[PDB]
Write a protein that binds this ligand. Sequence first.
Ligand code: CLA
Ligand code: CLA
Ligand code: CLA
Ligand code: CLA
Ligand code: CLA
Ligand SMILES: CCCCCCCCCCCCCCCC(=O)OC[C@H](COP(=O)(O)OC[C@@H](O)CO)OC(=O)CCCCCCCCCCCCCCC
Ligand SMILES: CCCCCCCS[C@@H]1O[C@H](CO)[C@@H](O)[C@H](O)[C@H]1O
Lengths: 121, 57
Amino acid sequence: TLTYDDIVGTGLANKCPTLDDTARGAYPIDSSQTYRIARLCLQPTTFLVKEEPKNKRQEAEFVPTKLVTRETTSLDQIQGELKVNSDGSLTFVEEDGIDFQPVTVQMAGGERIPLLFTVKN
Amino acid sequence: GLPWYRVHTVLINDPGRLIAAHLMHTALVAGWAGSMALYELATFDPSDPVLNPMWRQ
Ligand code: CLA
Ligand code: CLA
Ligand code: CLA
Ligand code: CLA
Ligand code: CLA
Ligand SMILES: CCCCCCCCCCCCCCCC(=O)OC[C@H](COP(=O)(O)OC[C@@H](O)CO)OC(=O)CCCCCCCCCCCCCCC
Ligand SMILES: CCCCCCCS[C@@H]1O[C@H](CO)[C@@H](O)[C@H](O)[C@H]1O
């Protein structure tokens, strides 16, 4: 539908594909057949970091942070096998893809928190 | 000549230069306020209003 030149520089390339509000159906699993996830995409919308109080007696909170590394955060083109187990549960086993992004966020007061946002293995 | 402790008396009969001196004084005071705030912000630790509030710092 859309080409690179429609997308380039807009920010859409850091977004995962969405589905319609009407898409509330069901996808049948046939336990005779083997399956794969052909594409898995993850688009973070919030990074929270747990506060580290000197008073290790209070319940420490995850707090909002400001992203400083721009629209470079999404995991995409991830694939792997989707096993069907004896109990009918499904197990996704990640094999390959763009499965990590270095991300720096900033706490109130300016402390920068780099992290390797990932789903490796 | 004027003794050292009287130098500013040249402004008594000079409203314009008195306003100038007052303006300079006001500028020094506002400059101090700005400086002091910046120094305080450069040193202040905001991470604990409970056991390390501003008045402990
Ligand atoms: C609004 C406040 C104010 C103002 C506008 C004045 C203005 C004046 N005073 Mg008065 N006076 C004041 C309050 C004030 N005074 C206070 C609080 C005291 C008691 C400490 C005095 C005691 C006093 C005496 C005994 C005399 C004056 C004199 C004078 C005149 C000449 C001043 C001069 O040339 O000094 C020149 C000063 C210097 C060259 C250096 C002074 C250095 C000081 C001592 C230390 C540094 C201070 C620092 C820079 C400022 C700190 C700010 C502070 C407010 C926190 C002038 C009309 C003289 C006068 O009447 O002449 C006919 C005079 O003999 N004043
Ligand atoms: C609000 C401050 C203030 C203002 C508006 C004035 C205004 C005036 N003064 Mg006065 N004076 C002041 C404070 C002030 N003075 C102080 C603190 C002293 C003692 C040093 C004097 C001593 C003085 C003398 C001897 C004379 C005047 C005179 C005058 C007039 C002409 C300008 C001049 O010659 O300045 C001279 C004064 C200065 C240039 C101030 C000295 C600067 C000091 C050292 C501060 C340095 C600032 C620096 C950036 C900070 C250092 C940081 C440090 C930690 C390293 C004018 C009415 C003249 C006048 O007309 O006589 C009839 C004159 O002869 N003043
Ligand atoms: C409507 C007329 C009017 C107004 C609004 C003022 C207001 C003021 N006067 Mg007074 N004054 C007046 C009539 C007026 N005066 C008349 C007719 C005389 C006889 C000539 C005087 C004699 C006089 C003397 C000797 C002094 C004052 C000073 C002051 C100031 C003291 C507070 C200060 O500096 O705050 C801090 C300043 C601010 C927060 C900034 C305010 C923004 C300004 C007003 C904008 C500047 C642009 C403006 C068009 C030019 C100046 C306007 C002028 C009428 C004040 C203040 C701005 C003192 C002063 O100037 O000290 C520095 C001072 O020494 N006045
Ligand atoms: C209500 C508040 C207030 C009042 C009434 C004044 C009044 C005055 N100021 Mg200002 N000032 C203020 C707030 C105030 N200040 C604040 C918040 C700041 C920022 C820190 C300043 C910064 C400032 C500077 C830089 C200067 C003034 C000066 C002056 C004097 C100018 C008139 C003069 O010729 O005196 C003649 C001087 C006197 C009458 C002597 C004042 C005696 C003071 C009160 C005690 C000083 C203590 C000690 C002996 C010296 C300090 C130790 C040293 C190591 C610093 C006058 C006494 C000027 C001045 O003093 O010029 C000579 C001057 O240079 N003020
Ligand atoms: C232009 C407008 C303006 C505004 C909105 C501010 C705002 C502020 N200032 Mg700044 N400041 C200004 C101009 C201004 N300032 C100017 C022109 C100077 C140079 C003189 C300064 C110098 C200054 C200093 C040194 C400081 C501030 C500080 C502050 C903060 C606290 C204010 C406070 O506690 O006041 C207190 C004010 C009063 C209690 C008013 C006193 C009024 C007296 C009693 C009046 C007496 C005479 C009157 C005519 C009597 C008749 C009354 C009648 C109604 C009956 C606030 C963010 C503080 C800060 O946090 O710094 C970072 C601080 O330390 N300011
Ligand atoms: C924040 C920025 C700060 C700015 C810095 C400000 C610098 C100003 C410093 C002011 C210095 C003033 C000195 C003036 C000194 C001075 O000029 O004195 C002599 C002076 C004489 O004045 P006359 O009226 O005779 O006029 C002569 C003129 O030529 C003077 O300008 O009298 C005074 O000034 C009165 C003050 C008495 C002070 C006398 C005390 C001396 C006693 C000795 C104390 C030690 C012994 C104790 C033993 C126990
Ligand atoms: C003339 C004022 C301009 C100076 C503004 C400085 C930026 S603001 C500065 O940022 C730091 C790091 O995020 C904080 O630790 C500190 O509390 C804050 O004051």
